Design a protein around this ligand. Sequence first.
Ligand SMILES: N#Cc1ccc(CNCc2ccc(F)cc2)cc1
Ligand SMILES: [Zn+2]
Length: 140
Amino acid sequence: SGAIYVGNYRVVNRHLATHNDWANLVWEDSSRDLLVSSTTAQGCDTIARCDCQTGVYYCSSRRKHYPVSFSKPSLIFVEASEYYPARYQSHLMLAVGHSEPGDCGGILRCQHGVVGIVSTGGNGLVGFADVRDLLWLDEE
Ligand SMILES: N#Cc1ccc(CNCc2ccc(F)cc2)cc1
Ligand SMILES: [Zn+2]
């Protein structure tokens, strides 16, 4: 589990979004595994605006942050998981690392701020849903 709290937005994995998230929906994309809802309180996170390919991500199933190199966001085939069938996911970045389903929502960050959140795992990779292209998260 986990979210990004930027401005008055809460960015979650679409598959973990709550009823309250859907009732306060700003934007959602199943192909990206993302959903954004509106918040009453302002949040503490800053979104990275950059093309970094190195950062640090939080792994809840290890209680550890790991430094990783990761691919640029692309359209990637993802094998079946506990929460999705086997399918193509867009705007997905991969790194070599540990990820189980409950790790979804852990933050990947670089020197510029939050890059994305854990969205995929298995076979010794961790996949992250990018948010750096969502420039509208920084205003309004
Ligand atoms: N909606 C939806 C939906 C969610 C999951 C699955 C795949 N269930 C079996 C499965 C579990 C774990 C695993 F690692 C591989 C396969 C299908 C549809
Ligand atoms: Zn960066």
